[PDB]
Design a protein around this motif. Structure first.
Motif, short mmCIF file in Angstrom:
data_model
loop_
_atom_site.label_atom_id
_atom_site.label_comp_id
_atom_site.label_asym_id
_atom_site.label_seq_id
_atom_site.Cartn_x
_atom_site.Cartn_y
_atom_site.Cartn_z
N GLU A 1 60.29 0.08 31.30
CA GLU A 1 59.24 -0.20 30.32
C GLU A 1 58.14 0.85 30.35
O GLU A 1 57.68 1.30 29.29
CB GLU A 1 58.62 -1.58 30.55
N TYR A 2 57.71 1.26 31.55
CA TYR A 2 56.49 2.03 31.70
C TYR A 2 56.69 3.54 31.64
O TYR A 2 55.70 4.27 31.49
CB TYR A 2 55.81 1.66 33.03
N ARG B 1 42.36 12.43 25.28
CA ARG B 1 42.34 11.83 23.94
C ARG B 1 41.34 10.68 23.86
O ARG B 1 40.66 10.50 22.84
CB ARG B 1 43.73 11.35 23.54
N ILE C 1 40.52 -14.83 15.18
CA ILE C 1 40.58 -14.85 13.72
C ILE C 1 41.75 -15.71 13.28
O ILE C 1 42.83 -15.71 13.89
CB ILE C 1 40.67 -13.43 13.13
N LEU D 1 43.73 -17.35 9.59
CA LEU D 1 43.90 -17.45 8.15
C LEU D 1 44.09 -18.91 7.78
O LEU D 1 44.90 -19.61 8.38
CB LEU D 1 45.10 -16.63 7.68
N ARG E 1 41.69 -17.68 3.28
CA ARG E 1 40.42 -17.11 3.71
C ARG E 1 40.40 -17.02 5.23
O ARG E 1 41.16 -17.70 5.92
CB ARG E 1 39.22 -17.92 3.18
N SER E 2 39.53 -16.15 5.74
CA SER E 2 39.50 -15.78 7.15
C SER E 2 38.44 -16.58 7.89
O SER E 2 37.28 -16.65 7.46
CB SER E 2 39.22 -14.29 7.32
N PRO F 1 33.37 -19.14 9.01
CA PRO F 1 33.91 -17.99 8.27
C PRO F 1 33.85 -16.72 9.10
O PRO F 1 32.92 -16.49 9.87
CB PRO F 1 32.99 -17.90 7.05
N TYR F 2 34.88 -15.88 8.93
CA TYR F 2 34.94 -14.58 9.58
C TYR F 2 34.01 -13.61 8.87
O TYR F 2 34.07 -13.49 7.64
CB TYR F 2 36.38 -14.07 9.56
N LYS F 3 33.17 -12.91 9.63
CA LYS F 3 32.10 -12.10 9.04
C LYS F 3 32.26 -10.60 9.25
O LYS F 3 31.34 -9.84 8.91
CB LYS F 3 30.74 -12.55 9.58
N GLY F 4 33.38 -10.13 9.80
CA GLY F 4 33.53 -8.70 9.99
C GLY F 4 32.69 -8.16 11.15
O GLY F 4 32.22 -8.91 12.02
N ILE G 1 26.14 -6.58 9.81
CA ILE G 1 25.04 -7.54 9.74
C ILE G 1 23.76 -6.93 10.30
O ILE G 1 22.68 -7.10 9.72
CB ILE G 1 25.43 -8.84 10.48
#
Lengths: 426, 318, 424
Positions: free
Chosen positions: C115-116, C192, C367, C369, C373-374, C381-384, C389
């Motif tokens: 895997e690694y 990176r 989050i 659905l 709506r989110s 409600p999901y506000k981003g 804000i």
């Protein structure tokens, strides 16, 4: 008398009847066909709407195992550029790594590493791979004097499957590997970690070169011939001749022209809603048809023109018309819930096209906006729906549940065996 | 080739036609069967939902002459302990009480098809449960049919119900597997999850009738489960051929149902928030009062007549 | 005789009067103080609510120039761990590299490599980094083949990113392991990730360059233990946070913190009167938090009949604290950026927001659905992103300062005037 052809049924007129089941929802197969020559791992397509499918959402659709049709509400080069973005998306291989030459001076090499890091630069001569310069090579004049030479390179041939490349990395106990063509020209750089990351999307829809699949819509107007040419040269997998009335001289002749001018691209024609329209598009050479004329209860085609065919009957009539032709049909319109999607499949659809349900996802066009404590996509404000993958998972979860209820182990069974009951308005 | 099997009817599609009557509502008989071996004095069963049936409401249901199915959203030892509470309960006189040969109140209990199901059945049986209900969303399946067979072979002396189903072929499958009764109801509600999510369902009047026709002459009863909002629907389900009716959310929020009395915004609720509905006996009285009225209108003196003689009219939306 | 002390005003009772202005909104200064000893570059604090402030949002608040108060609806060590997450945050460090020990079998390492890969495996023993197994090492046990300790190129946790980047270049490598002063493995840094790292010029930081954070305590039995664990984790300010700060319990606990942990800042609250402000100041508070029943239909008003409209509460506390050096934080009742500006002009030094920040990306919750709506679920409600804000709130404050002609927070708090308006 009044010329009524039939009573036609929509999604709410019918329910699937449960049948004897041995396969759990999580175990059924969702594999299907989009066109004669394109298979999909899930029966899901995103519509060519300017609020739904550009490159970003098309990439996510292909990663989920479906496909996106890039909309045509943009210039020709702009649409070709959207197609290029999808075909250039790197599932795991870095196609254009930063390189040096044998005559490159160590001083320029070191200055490059300060900007890009000591990842180990491939050494090329006019595109031909001749070595690599590791950090160790600098630790322990030009690049030629210190480079790891060709005989010490572990490479893989372009077009080798990702899992086979991962096995060559494993057997050689290395993390990075260069990709070359039959003339040992450098074609890319691949990494063990990036192949493993690619398993995040095990259903990804890819062409035979390993590029994500994508479609693009065109119309019938004057520049259609130039637009098709640009989309084809950009590497599009399927051209969708996409109009309000596919059963028309314009659409049939355009499908015919695509098939005869570009035999190596797939072509979809639509939209249609009758047996006879399906046979006309099939005879014109369509690799698939798209079904949906006024499928919604309150849509513009019904209200303005009085025209439409309820979508369950449209799908079933088209499916019967195309049976034994090898031509798939895409159900386009009227789907509000995953349960409708399942009914469309049992009526004969090969896959379903969704539009407004995908508008407002992360990947769809538009920018997020907060307006009175709630999130929207702005361009006219649709609610923000988060990641496309969650909507796809819900839709396929519902289809899986229906297949479990009907005892369908795969899409071919789901399309041909379960039955409906017809219900009343009560 | 749209593969449509039939037009299927729900409760609102039909009405009972009045017939010549001689027996008053108060004098008709409501006795029926839950399974091959269990009779009930009223055709009422409480659902195996964690807002509806634990020991307290199962005791009440049996005292009324019906039966409760203890829900399985609990540990195996907890569910067995709930069964034991009902079987051991000793008292008011309840002369209709559903009782076993030993005089103990009857009770059922639900199991699924998961890996611990064998252990759960064994514990319910050792606690004295009268009937094991193999209770899943899709009873017409290998796992449910195989589990019903295993209960019938492993514990021959307990009754077993399989469900849920909605077709004649499913009914025949469960009965051939040895079910002592079948439970009928797949997407019976108008906007239920099965219909919205999976697009699957059979309107409940046709499902009941199709199952009743499949089982006629076999001795295997069928229980109508879902879609019933009013006593009038219950009457219709019986005439369509149900032997008894299972109620769920209608019993949630009763005194005897799980949850605690809660006051809020000047109204009473059960929280675990469902409106508080008072004593179960008043709902049972209303439901059975409406069934009796229907039997009076149709002239049916007992449940067997009610299930086989009266007729429906089909009506429109208008 | 009906004992009425005054008419008290709320946000909707007043408006700011425009004044002569020469400084554009984009050019005013938002710098202020949270406490006697803590400055902030914007006057914003996130509330100690379990739907608002854990480490993720506290980090974002500090990066914006404000601060977060971590809520106390958790165990003591869980709250200490949230503080540690903020104090030790660095976006460029990949955390928890998968390790091996010298007595791991080569066969097992080859299994993990499926895997690694072979990039490769740090080796630890007794919890200390002791080597690494690279791919060339694999072409018995890890002890035989590992690259030894003296050949490792490592960086100290907390080293500035440009220094780590210079060490990568000087050593001709693209990644190196990160260790602490015990040579414990703390993560991995790559070229990176260093290049991708965002800078935060306004970030609220302590003297060591670590992001600031606060944490709430109450007055119950384990408060002393909780405070001790927060202080040891590097918390910048302890917030003694109760419904009624003008009480024996809060005053005596505030005094205990100041006397017991004199090198940590302490906030007492909540209060709403001049006399409560003086009592907390005399107890040693480095700031007070103002707001008792500030909302119109909040529970304190409905259930207890208690509250003080927030404009008057802020102004009365500010008058009482003038010339003491003790800041006041306005906590509650603020619906729009315009209310925030009003709170500043009434005398607040900064403003604490609660449910407005709930449902943002960085706030607690996942989050979901639901009906197209989110939402965030634990549903709101999901506000981003929190940053959007904060940008709108500070944009509104900047506009108000432009309207009033206030070049900085100190002017905004002391010079502009209100009109009182009617219900109409």
């Amino acid at each position: 008398m009044l010329r009524i052809s039939q009573e036609a049924l929509t999604f709410d007129d019918v329910l699937l009847i449960p049948g004897y089941s041995e396969v759990l929802p999580k175990d059924v197969s969702l594999k299907t066909r989009l066109t004669r020559g394109i298979e999909l791992n899930i029966p899901l397509v995103s519509a060519a709407m300017d609020t739904v499918t550009e490159a970003r959402l098309a990439i996510a659709m292909a990663q989920e195992g479906g496909i996106g049709i890039i909309h045509k509400n943009m210039g020709i080069e702009q649409q070709a550029a959207e197609v290029r973005k999808v075909k250039k998306h790197e599932t795991a291989i870095v196609r254009d790594p930063v390189t040096v030459t044998p005559s490159t001076k160590i001083i320029e090499l070191l200055q490059m590493a300060r900007e890009y890091g000591f990842s180990g630069f491939p050494v090329v001569e006019q595109g031909e791979l001749v070595g690599i310069v590791t950090g160790r090579d600098l630790r322990v004049d030009t690049v030629a004097a210190i480079m790891t030479p060709k005989d010490k390179l572990v490479t893989a041939r372009e077009g080798t499957p990702l899992e086979e490349m991962k096995a060559k990395l494993y057997e050689n106990r290395i993390e990075k590997m260069l990709v070359v063509d039959e003339n040992f020209y450098l074609r890319g750089l691949v990494t063990f970690r990036d192949i493993e990351k690619a398993k995040t999307y095990p259903l990804a829809s890819k062409d035979e070169q390993g590029r994500l699949r994508v479609g693009a819509a065109v119309g019938t107007g004057a520049d259609t011939g130039e637009r098709v040419a640009a989309l084809v040269a950009a590497g599009v997998d399927v051209v969708v001749v996409d109009t309000a009335h596919g059963h028309s001289k314009g659409v049939i002749e355009r499908v015919r022209w695509v098939k005869q001018t570009f035999p190596d691209v797939q072509v979809i024609g639509g939209n249609i809603a009758t047996a006879e329209a399906a046979k006309a598009l099939a005879e014109a050479g369509a690799d698939a048809v798209k079904v949906g004329i006024g499928p919604g209860s309150i849509c513009t085609t019904r209200i303005v023109a009085g025209v439409g065919v309820p979508q369950i009957s449209a799908i079933a009539n088209v499916a019967a018309a195309l049976e034994g032709t090898g031509v798939p049909l895409i159900a386009d319109g009227g789907i509000r819930f995953s349960g409708d999607l399942a009914k469309a499949m049992v009526a004969g659809a090969y896959c379903v096209m969704m539009g407004s349900m995908f508008a407002g996802t992360e990947e769809a066009p538009g920018e997020i906006e907060l307006f009175q404590g709630r999130s929207y996509k702005s361009y006219g404000r649709v609610p923000y729906k988060g990641a496309l993958s969650a909507i796809v998972h819900q839709l396929m979860g519902g289809l899986r549940a229906a297949m479990g209820y009907t005892g369908s182990a795969d899409i071919q069974q789901m399309r041909t065996q379960p039955q409906f009951v017809r219900i009343t308005g009560a």
